Symmetry: C3
Subunit: 207 residues, 3 copies
């Protein structure tokens, strides 16, 4: 039948694993249903989002059915200094330095962090500003996601290194055409055997 | 003689550095005598063993005289998702999804983590499932051990990248035949100067 | 005009960001004025300096106008084990092993950690022994600094990899010949518009 995506703690007695969406407080963090964060000590998913400021307007977007490993960190665009000259943020200390407060054109802003659906993000991963992660990708533990990740690619390391693609490009096209995460959830439920077990040529044929 | 291997805190006034073996309470974690964990906040060495589940049956093995740096993490085989089709673990959330429960043969299982003797593991090292680390190797701090490490190798980085060998190939097998760590403690105590000073030819001829 | 460099918490209401120099109680750690540490939970910058023993005598020097990201750790030379033979530190456990203690001629010491002026160090950076980081460099977050960083270099990764230089070789030498961080503070304030916006030629004019 399925659990409730509005239930913050969907596992009996487990107070560390949280469905991300219901916990969110912040307008510009948008996470899909059923995506969870396995906490380390019960900290919120947002507590893992860092350098996130309304002034900049950048968003963190996560798809449906994503796995976020404990300690995964999201570094938003507020982290990058001005690099035209000296990087030191003089204006932060005020006392006559407030005058030199930069505008957003002066900063190296990279865009929103956007993570697709069915992404397995390993433990203690760090995601840097502006990176896109395709559907069905696997981020190895301890990875620092420095660049974009193709759908159904396995990556890892610091800086990020491409390892393998989970399936062929032909099977990858078929998974991206089917987009099971976007189907009505009665249909997800009566095909879950096939989604879990990766027999694309069965769902091939139902549609 | 030397310290008592069953002494959990062998350094007086030090509540952080622990001998691993006498703190172990799990039957799948075999650690040799004298190997120590220099902990950060006084936490257990077992606390660093993650995703370790009895139903998987995988073991963590560590030899004798190993230096395990603070924050070293062991990610066991229970951490890898099913990759046949969808990585998402539906069954954990039950409410009808418990039926789609995967078996040991459905998960990608890589085997035990086996660490050798006289290994120096750095601080904040993460060891991936199923990796083997030979005797007398050095793991640089912050390393992520994603593959096996040959005996007496210096390695580090993420992914792990080979740096160099500590001695020549010939000298490395003079050490692996000697196996000073497997000798009686009274033989070790009488030859500690050369074990520490590295005089392999002396130990060879002793 | 400007913040007082001897002020520990130079941002009103902010208990995390600290000017480093006025918090320093241990000699062999020399940090310049206005160099700050953005702490995660209000922890002292010193607490990030690990394996720092007076018996070894190495120093951590940091210039002025540096930004130290939260969680950045400095691994001092005391962290390196002896590598002639067994890296196991027998003498630490005492009980008859105390008399097999190394001298500093026996250990792989690598010198002081020296970081220049106007360096931007990312979050969770780990800096290893003996590394020198030039003026104006930028360290990517999560980087393990395994080697020296040229001035006005951008670097990152584990192990460290060179990414690119911030300006042309000629403009870099101009910034190094100007040394704005060492100018009298009244001189700096008059020219901060151009220090901050990268207009090197008018700075040379000034
Ligand atoms: C991350 C960082 C260095 C870290 O080592 C250490 C920091 F994380 C510590 C900290 N951060 C903040 C507070 O404490 C902080 O607020 N910001 C960090 C970058 C984004 C944001 C910022 O400053 O945004 C302003 C924006 C226009 C206006 O924001 C204000 O806050 N204005 C303001 C504050 C006042 C306070 C009291 C009285 C009057 C005031 C008037 N105006 C703009 C985009 C600045 C961008 C920039 O320099 N980027 C780089 C950053 C470097
Ligand atoms: C890391 C992870 C997801 C994380 O995002 C989130 C998790 F870490 C959170 C959490 N984990 C657990 C609880 O909370 C948890 O129990 N497991 C995680 C993987 C391994 C295990 C699991 O499910 O295993 C079952 C297995 C049949 C369970 O059923 C049993 O009947 N177990 C059992 C029976 C016993 C009988 C007698 C005495 C002791 C017993 C102990 N266990 C099988 C092998 C594997 C299932 C799978 O899909 N693996 C992949 C998952 C990956
Ligand atoms: C990092 C590590 C293992 C970690 O896994 C676990 C460790 F961090 C745990 C811990 N360390 C200590 C306590 O708990 C500890 O005391 N030390 C670690 C390295 C440095 C030090 C040590 O042993 O030092 C002595 C030294 C002669 C005797 O000790 C003194 O302190 N003597 C002394 C100090 C004086 C100071 C000023 C003036 C006169 C003095 C006279 N005598 C010498 C240099 C030994 C160096 C060595 O074997 N290096 C390797 C390191 C291994
Ligand atoms: C997020 C969770 O539920 S599991 C915790 C983190 N573990 C990992 O990311 C393991 C990393 N494994 C790999 O990178 C391997 O190369 C792989 C082929 C995917 C197995
Ligand atoms: C066991 C402990 O806690 S000692 C602390 C860990 N520190 C380290 O291992 C330092 C990392 N650096 C290296 O290993 C270098 O590659 C080396 C060339 C061997 C020196
Ligand atoms: C120290 C602080 O205030 S923010 C922490 C550091 N930030 C980072 O490491 C972001 C990583 N990205 C980069 O450095 C890029 O390569 C950049 C040079 C800006 C282009
Ligand atoms: Cl320490
Ligand atoms: Cl030194
Ligand atoms: Mg690398």
């Amino acid at each position: 039948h399925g659990p409730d995506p509005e239930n913050i703690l969907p596992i009996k007695g487990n107070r560390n694993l949280q469905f991300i969406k219901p916990t969110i407080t912040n307008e510009n963090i948008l996470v899909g249903e059923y995506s969870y964060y396995d906490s380390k000590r019960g900290e919120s998913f947002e507590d893992q989002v860092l350098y996130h400021y309304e002034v900049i307007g950048d968003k963190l977007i996560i798809g449906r059915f994503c796995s976020i490993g404990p300690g995964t960190t999201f570094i938003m665009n507020g982290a990058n200094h001005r690099m035209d000259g000296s990087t030191y943020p003089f204006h932060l200390f005020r006392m006559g330095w407030e005058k030199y407060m930069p505008s957003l054109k002066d900063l190296p802003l990279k865009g929103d962090i956007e993570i697709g659906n069915d992404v397995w993000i390993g433990r203690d991963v760090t995601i840097m500003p502006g990176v896109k992660i395709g559907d069905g990708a696997i981020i190895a533990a301890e990875a620092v996601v420095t660049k974009n990740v193709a759908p159904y690619s396995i990556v890892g390391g610091n800086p990020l290194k491409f390892i393998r693609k989970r399936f062929s490009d032909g099977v990858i096209e078929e998974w991206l055409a089917l987009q099971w995460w976007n189907l009505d959830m009665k249909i997800i439920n009566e095909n879950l055997p096939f989604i879990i077990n990766g027999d694309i040529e069965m769902l091939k044929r139902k549609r």
